[PDB]
Design a protein around this ligand. Structure first.
Ligand SMILES: CC(=O)NCCCC[C@H](N)C(=O)O
Ligand SMILES: CC(=O)NCCCC[C@H](N)C(=O)O
Lengths: 489, 490
């Protein structure tokens, strides 16, 4: 069993220490990465052996296949590449020390290799070791070679084991970092200032979201983990920093599952003297440019239900489809809806309720205008948004800006919102009124800031984790979080 | 005269009157054709008296000064993006004389406005825009300080950062530099093949030690969580997983006192590199720091005022190579004497030798006068305060960790007598680490298990972004480099 293997191996390692062969006190200086070792010496023809060149490589042993006792082959792994170590007893420092190192090494051990490049008769590039050094043994039993960790729960609870055994996982978080790095580069080149704003607030945000509450001792007061940096960003726009963005963590005290995590990453930027239409060009350039630069093409494949399930083609080629919500809902329903400034009335609500019935689009027991419109929008518009599609001018039925239609777009990809933009409010009187009525159902410092004068501004937000899922062909959030929150063992 | 509250009430009335009259400024939208900065670059070559009636442009900004020059002419000092441009509102050139007076009498100091007009330069030689139409966009409802005065009261600057940014341009340039420091680090490490990662800020076990943590309660899991102080354990688990070069520039949290050099949240950078030791990271730190200073500021030489502008100015020279000193030997050379052999630093006999030394050289040490604390004060007064230029101080004795001949393998880089970053050779013996976590006043068994799968020889590196931003913005408290610093209750 795995526990016995662990007890046996830990004993053998303890014995190596008392014998003065402690593997850990060693430090190993690599002369060439495995990736570069391949590049330089992949041109050698079968049977080559560069006796003159001695180099030091390191990596993790994934396979050990003997060939009589005079020859052992190791599958040395690292950086996502493979390199064969052909341990030939003749070529080792001595026969006695060749036997001794092979006796102690097991699958999974970290080792450094000093030897000469070369290609075997079968033609696979190798390094012929003059000396192999154990640097850090693997004390636990790993799965059988071509087996691995299929159990997602284990993969998520032991990410280091997941990366040791599954190369596709490493490529995911490389993709994740390239997304964040691309956003910074795109926005920096537009003159945006990357900023950091408080993650702990003296009062909870004016938003529907159960918060993380923590207590500050010296202040004798509770602090609240942030849900978003918006109000800090607009205070800086008032201060004269016209273009600000922040790619940082947000916190929500809610339920954990395959699509929700208590901490997650968002990007927000605010741009003075812009409206939601100006941000549509920017969103199209960034998102499309991001996809092509990272993946090599404008067309991506996504598996909403797993590799075995259906596969959707997603075409990020510009221009992205644009739609005005009400007009397209009318065109999709084949009927004219009430004029947009009569959407608060109870007569319009009835009409929507009837429409949902007549087309078998059932609504939550709360059959309101907001909910009947939500499920109509979802069933007739959002579901058709396979390619990147801007959905704009949503009915108010409360922030944003104003003939009954909100100044805004949401960008949908694979039937889901990945980012959205708003034209911002700057009337300090109106912003105040919202706060005080919201507080009966307030940020005094932010109201004051608007009293000094916020210019016309446009806001923009994106959920990074969702974007990482769609571009890594992942269908749960635990695949794109290095150490996802997990329910108790 | 008018006090600030009365000004606010009058202005609020006036702006409400504008809405009553169908002249609401806020719903107005204004697209800018060119930024004030590019405006100056593109038309500063013009000569005095010029007026380009052939070009109409839309600029915008905040009114800082309004100077009437007769009944038909008004001058506005318009500022934005850290630059300034004069608006010469000549009633003759305005759309109409009646609209000209109407708008100018609404406008006050601090109002945000959009200007549509022609470039030009007056007879005195000030580049200006000649408005055809000025638009009120967002009025400043509060009274600002007089033009050449401002906000010197530090507390008001920190509590109302927007007003500090409106009135003080040196404040904008500080946070521009701050952002360039972080961006430069990302660029430097990204070139060396590092993977920028994100690790949990919320832990289920209190991390580290001697760091009172922020505690928060997760409702669904019915459990307490702890805000992180360092990402280190998560990083090394990723090195175990084969990601050999990782870094994270993120926020750390300490439940501590709030003062001019302590903030409950702060930014650190850490990276871990497999198959490297602290020596390998010395050349990396040197290149990164020297190149950073020169790139951002234009030279290796920086001037720092640790006591304020009207204080001693220090010349800090980042020219490579940085001075390197081994702690014990240079301490021996500075004190002019031989110290006990390094293996004997845990003996009462060594503690008395150091006590006798501290007394003989008037190195005050507050009880308890242990060896670790006696050595720290001797080092501070004979080495650390000598390090004006960037200086590596290395091989500190162990009596002064879970780090790695009685001398731990690390270097601290000191600038202006204080540590800006440090590096350690990491420990990878799992059997050791499991016992070393058994220091108390908990144990991360998940991290102990990960090491049991095998961590290669690794080296860690850590830097406080805030202190570095302080030294490069000529700031001497931490609130100057934090956009919204924590402030005691008002
Ligand atoms: C008016 C408004 O909704 N402001 C919020 C910030 C701007 C929108 C952006 N998409 C966001 O909230 O992230
Ligand atoms: C051995 C040790 O103290 N490790 C801690 C993490 C590595 C050092 C790094 N410079 C840091 O603590 O930030």
């Amino acid at each position: 069993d795995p526990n016995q293997y662990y007890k046996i191996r830990s004993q053998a390692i303890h014995q190596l220490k008392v014998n003065g062969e402690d593997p850990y006190p060693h430090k190993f200086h690599v002369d060439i990465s495995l990736t570069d070792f391949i590049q330089k010496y992949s041109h050698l023809q079968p049977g080559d052996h560069l006796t003159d060149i001695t180099l030091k490589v390191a990596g993790r042993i994934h396979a050990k296949r003997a060939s009589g006792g005079k020859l052992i082959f190791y599958d040395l792994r690292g950086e996502g590449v493979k390199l064969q170590v052909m341990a030939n007893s003749r070529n080792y420092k001595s026969e006695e020390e060749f036997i001794h190192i092979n006796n102690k090494l097991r699958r999974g051990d970290i080792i450094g290799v000093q030897g000469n490049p070369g290609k075997t008769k079968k033609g696979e590039l190798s390094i012929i070791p003059y000396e192999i050094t154990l640097l850090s043994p693997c004390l636990h039993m790993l799965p059988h070679l071509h087996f691995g960790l299929k159990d997602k729960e284990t993969r998520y609870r032991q990410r280091y084991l997941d990366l040791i055994l599954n190369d596709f996982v490493r490529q995911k978080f490389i993709i994740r970092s390239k997304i964040i790095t691309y956003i910074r580069s795109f926005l920096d080149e537009l003159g945006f200032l990357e900023i950091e704003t408080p993650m702990m607030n003296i009062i909870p945000g004016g938003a529907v979201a159960k918060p993380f509450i923590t207590y500050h001792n010296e202040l004798d007061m509770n602090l609240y983990m942030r849900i978003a940096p918006e109000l800090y960003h607009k205070m800086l726009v008032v201060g004269g920093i016209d273009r600000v963005y922040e790619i940082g963590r947000q916190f929500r005290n809610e339920g954990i599952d395959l699509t929700h995590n208590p901490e997650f990453t968002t990007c927000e930027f605010y741009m003075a003297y812009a409206d939601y239409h100006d941000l549509m060009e920017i969103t199209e350039k960034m998102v499309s440019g991001m996809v092509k630069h990272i993946t090599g093409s404008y067309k991506v494949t996504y598996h909403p239900d797993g590799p075995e399930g259906q596969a959707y083609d997603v075409d990020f080629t510009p221009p992205f489809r644009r739609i005005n919500m009400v007009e397209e809902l009318e065109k999709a329903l084949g009927m004219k809806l009430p004029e947009t400034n009569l959407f608060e009335t109870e007569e319009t609500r009835k009409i929507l309720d009837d429409i949902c019935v007549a087309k078998a689009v059932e609504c939550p027991p709360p059959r309101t205008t907001a909910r009947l419109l939500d499920k109509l929008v979802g069933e007739f518009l959002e579901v058709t948004c396979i390619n990147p599609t801007f959905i704009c001018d949503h009915p108010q039925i409360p922030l944003a800006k104003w003939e009954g239609l909100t100044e805004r777009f949401e960008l949908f990809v694979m039937k889901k919102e990945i980012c959205n933009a708003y034209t911002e409010l700057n009337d300090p009187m109106r912003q105040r009124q919202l706060f005080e009525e919201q507080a009966k159902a307030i940020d005094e410092n932010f109201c004051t800031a608007l009293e000094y004068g916020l210019p016309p501004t446009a806001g923009w937000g994106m959920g990074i984790d969702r974007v990482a899922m769609f571009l890594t062909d992942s269908n749960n959030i635990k695949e794109v979080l290095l150490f996802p929150a997990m329910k108790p063992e």
